[PDB]
Amino acid sequence: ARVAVLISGTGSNLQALIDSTREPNSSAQIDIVISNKAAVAGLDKAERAGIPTRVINHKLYKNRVEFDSAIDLVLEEFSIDIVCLAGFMRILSGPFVQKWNGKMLNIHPSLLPSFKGSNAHEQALETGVTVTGCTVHFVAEDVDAGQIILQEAVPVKRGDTVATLSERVKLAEHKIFPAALQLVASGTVQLGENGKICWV
Template sequence: ALTWKIPEIFCWLHKEGNLSEEEMTRTFNCGIGAVLVVQKELAQQVLKDIQRHEAAWLIGKVVSPQKGSARVKVHNLLRALQANRSLSLHSHIQGKIQTNKVKVAVLISGTGTNLEALINSTKKPTSFAQIVLVVSNKAGVEGLRKAERAGIPTRVIDHKLYESRTEFDSAVDKVLEEFSVELICLAGFMRILSGPFVKKWEGKILNIHPSLLPSFKGANAHKLVLQAGVRVTGCTVHFVAEEVDAGAIIFQEAVPVKVGDTVETLSERVKEAEHRAFPAALQLVASGAIQVGEAGKIYWK
């Protein structure tokens, strides 16, 4: 069986060019890259040796051709193209099962709809991330129940019990250290983090904003979008910097603004995009495909 992630460009060519499966396999390698043909008995050992250095898979076997048949036959390419067509930038990340996953904490303040999307995506064996902790600054919110149902440890750290943002952030930081957290996702977390906390976790905090940054920063993004009369909005996942909504952009998805939209209808449409974008961005960062480089700029590995 052949299972691999086809880069988005090939899915786009297949769809927009109305190309047949035969034409795709004849013209493009569809992202397979280098192929090694080895003795069947040595295949598993060779695979393990290569995987110490590169992502690799067993993708097929060599058989004697039947008379009059093609020398090379690719099975199920069309199915793979269709399955991958909806993927975006994160589709180049290989789909092998991940064992050493990055430990992630999700910070919330409410219903946890983005948290739920992150939980569902990280439960997949191909995810590079594992949610080990959910922190809320409010007790009794639905997001905490979602985490508990998923078997994820939760902590409530009430900001009202602390005299300053710095003291509150220190309490959060202590819990993050306790769980050996490596990445933080802000999913509807309604607190602005202090400078020292952001500096300590630079390049390790992801936030999602309901607009195509740098446009419509801050609160009330949907209201500002409708007032401006733009026809396209969306969502942005970015690294957190000291300035609000100013960190390097990891992933964006565009969403149309429709005639007659209200803040509520537009918010619901953008939310659907958020539930795709946040998991995609987390996978990019957890896999090491994206990092923050010099001067806060995105670095693609």
Template sequence: MTGRKRVGVLISGRGSNLQALIDAAKAPDYPAELVLVISNVAGVQGLARAEAAGIPTRVISHKDFAGREPFEAALDAALNDAGVEILCNAGFMRLLTESFVARWHDRHLNIHPSLLPAFKGLNTHERVLESGAKITGATVHFVRAAMDDGPIIAQASVPVNPGDTPDILAARVLEAEHKLYPHALALVASGAVRVEGEHVVGMTQQNS
């Protein structure tokens, strides 16, 4: 398929959402192809997933740089060298500077395991259970400088069941993430959605 958007993925760990994107991109009519996977941690499972799928990989460790800016300059150079058009965070455990985010404005996606803007940040499932919420879920959004902020592309709802533990709830939400992320990337890569102001126009809901 010609005209597929070239996608780079940033990871730090096992890469289960990366695998969902890899599997989706195998379809001949999927509007995106994965052309580079970068991890800031060597030896993680996500790199093995990418290599098994024949996708080029790079390890760019933040520990090798004197600060965030030179680390991000190396990321940016690698992504541009690969001709990346859309960037996806998939379990990438580094906060990015406003300068980097600006360079990838409205081309940079992230997935978070809650129905944003609720429960931003870490320990999401513990906080959901402590709150007594009956519904949680997952969100794919365009990245902005603030953590877990930015125009929402798509969301999936997940029930909170009696007796859930954080691990049980996390596993249920992760199943929804694996459907949601390929769906959201396809919306962006195909041009089905666009950003107007700080809102996504043309959003298609994906329920679990």
């Protein structure tokens, strides 16, 4: 299966996916990395690994639909089967999501359905949980509401900050994102016709 990874920043999840998809038994290959932001570290990681990159400045299109259309054109250019959102911090439009339904994965740094949105760690700390974690899910139109593929729990330690908690949770993210991608790329897991997760 041919994979695009979309990023907005550092790209530690991208690197974990690069590492995993290069293992001999990987059912996935990463063929393109797309960023909505210029000059971010994730682009350096892609270039270092010999993977093509494209930057699509969302600040250059009239609306969300046109921006997503620009992404989709690149996806078609590289004959992509599966899209991974790996620190990609934009909401995707309905038609784009529907087109890629069952073929687009996202990593989110909480145990969904808790702490949806862009600041999950802040929320977890404010709420006072002692267990948080991360989630890989299929992307649906409603944000962070799509079908869950894998999750991993991570403890919150007394005195944690976004810095120390995000660091601990990223260790787990780097485990479950590669595992989830392999499950989908191998056809082991798919989005079921009834909308529910199907272990084939």
